[PDB]
């Protein structure tokens, strides 16, 4: 009913600024507070500030004003939020959502404020980094590889830059028994993550295993073999 | 034991999430007397 | 804002309660409670310290008095493991929420399986190594790993350990990757990865 649709991801180097758009649809925008949140990937909620789209008059928390600046546009029915000397701490989700209801339409009729709707959260990293594509290894348990350690075969992904990086197995024919660990932000400023096929060679689906791996921002294609 | 006396032997108190609890009050522990001759 | 416990992990079909406490900086009507899954848009569950939003199921129960505040939720599902954030109204300039309780309901109770990785070729003739030693089929998260050469390389300052990953084998899992110059594949005659879990 209510639809809060925001911009799509951002990547930044420190000292920078950035702007950020929540397009608003279903509901009468004039009427409505429109709120900026951040949350840091595992942290907590964060509210930065908000904006009467009907004149522009506009609220912050002191802990993000003169960073932040927020705007309203009643032509494009699009609120906007800019951040401004960039760090990697602002590494980020920033949701726009109401804390608001005129009506709270669909949710009830009071609104006491309280959060009703919200955007789809758009992501802001900040690196020292630039573009660059993975590198892909081969892990097999123990010293050498084994017949009874086909069981956990995996790859290490290494080093790339900025976010996603795709993964599956063996041509996308494989997922049974398929296994991936959280990807992690490097000291070099560039991402990696781990993944298996926790299934032996008992089978023509598993006699051989492949890490396919591609990573959208380079175009780069790896399709490496484990053994 | 009874903490806000309602009758006819129910007590009301504030307990655990804490609730107003009603429930038939204690008089005492128990106490089996070792006695012998 | 306080909220209890850290996390919240009791059993399915149960009631479990949790709580959400500020300083007197706040006002008494104005405190509501959302739910997060991973990577999704807060849901607004219950607002004005009580009232549950329209589409919103019977069995949660908001209640509490001066800034002392509480949400049960009751006939628990897995669908409630998420983590859970309260908010209240800085009385009038400023919105304040929650720490995000996670909702780590009871799965399972299990000791973790692992399986231990040494450098591979075409790491070290890429002029590098990385050592990785994988737990899996545990619960609760109560996990702790040691690296081994084979007395000790914990002290490494490349050493790392992601998150846990939760699974449909109501179970954590976990990996640990010790990244290496490829010469210490070539000092270290052994590499070895020791496990502690439940306790």
């Known amino acids: 009913e209510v639809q809060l649709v925001e911009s799509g991801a951002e990547v930044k180097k420190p000292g920078a600024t950035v702007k950020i758009s929540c397009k608003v649809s279903?509901?009468?925008?004039?009427?409505?507070?429109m709120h900026w949140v951040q949350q840091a990937p595992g942290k907590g909620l964060e509210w930065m500030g908000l904006?009467?789209?009907?004149?522009?008059?506009?609220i912050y928390a002191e802990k993000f004003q003169g960073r932040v600046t927020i705007t309203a546009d009643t032509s494009t029915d699009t609120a906007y939020m800019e951040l401004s000397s960039l760090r990697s701490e602002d590494t980020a989700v920033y949701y726009c959502?109401?804390?608001?209801?005129?009506?709270?339409?669909?949710?009830?009729?009071?609104?006491?404020?309280?959060?009703?709707?919200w955007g789809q959260g758009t992501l802001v990293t900040v690196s020292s980094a630039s573009t660059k594509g993975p590198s892909v290894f081969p892990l097999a348990p123990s010293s050498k590889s084994t017949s009874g350690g086909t069981a956990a075969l995996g790859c290490l992904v290494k080093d790339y830059f900025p976010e996603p990086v795709t993964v599956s197995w063996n041509s996308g024919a494989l997922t049974s028994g398929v296994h991936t660990f959280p990807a992690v932000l490097q000291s070099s400023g560039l991402y990696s993550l781990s993944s298996v096929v926790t299934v032996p060679s008992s089978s023509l689906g598993t006699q051989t295993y492949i890490c396919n791996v591609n990573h959208k921002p380079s175009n780069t294609k790896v399709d490496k073999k484990v053994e | 034991e009874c903490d806000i006396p309602i009758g006819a032997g129910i007590c009301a108190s504030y307990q655990t999430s804490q609730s107003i609890i009603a429930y038939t009050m204690s008089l005492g522990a128990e106490n089996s007397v070792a006695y012998s001759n | 804002l306080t909220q209890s416990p850290g996390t919240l992990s009791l059993s399915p079909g149960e009631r479990a309660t949790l709580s959400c406490r500020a300083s007197?900086?706040?006002?008494?009507?104005?405190l509501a409670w959302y739910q997060q899954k991973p990577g999704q848009a807060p849901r607004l569950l219950i607002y004005?310290?009580?009232s549950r939003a329209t589409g919103i199921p019977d069995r949660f129960s908001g209640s509490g008095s001066g800034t002392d505040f509480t949400l049960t939720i009751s006939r628990l599902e897995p669908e409630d493991f998420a983590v859970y954030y309260c908010?209240?109204?800085?009385?009038?300039?400023?919105?304040?929420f929650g720490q995000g309780t996670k909702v780590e309901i009871k799965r399972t109770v299990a000791a973790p399986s692992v399986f231990i990785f040494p450098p591979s070729d075409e790491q070290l003739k890429s002029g590098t190594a990385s050592v990785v030693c994988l737990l899996n089929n545990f619960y609760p998260r109560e996990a702790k790993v040691q690296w081994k050469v084979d007395n000790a390389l914990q002290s490494g300052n490349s050493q790392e350990s992601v998150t846990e990953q939760d699974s449909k084998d109501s179970t954590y899992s976990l990996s640990s990757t010790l990244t290496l110059s490829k010469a210490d594949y070539e000092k270290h005659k052994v590499y070895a990865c020791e496990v502690t879990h439940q306790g």
């Open positions: 904006v009467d789209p009907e004149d522009g008059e506009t």
């Open positions: 908010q209240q109204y800085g009385s009038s300039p400023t919105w304040t």
């Open positions: 007197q900086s706040v006002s008494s009507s104005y």
């Open positions: 004005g310290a009580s």
């Open positions: 279903g509901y009468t925008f004039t009427d409505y507070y």
């Open positions: 959502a109401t804390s608001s209801g005129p009506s709270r339409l669909c949710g009830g009729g009071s609104c006491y404020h309280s959060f009703d709707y």
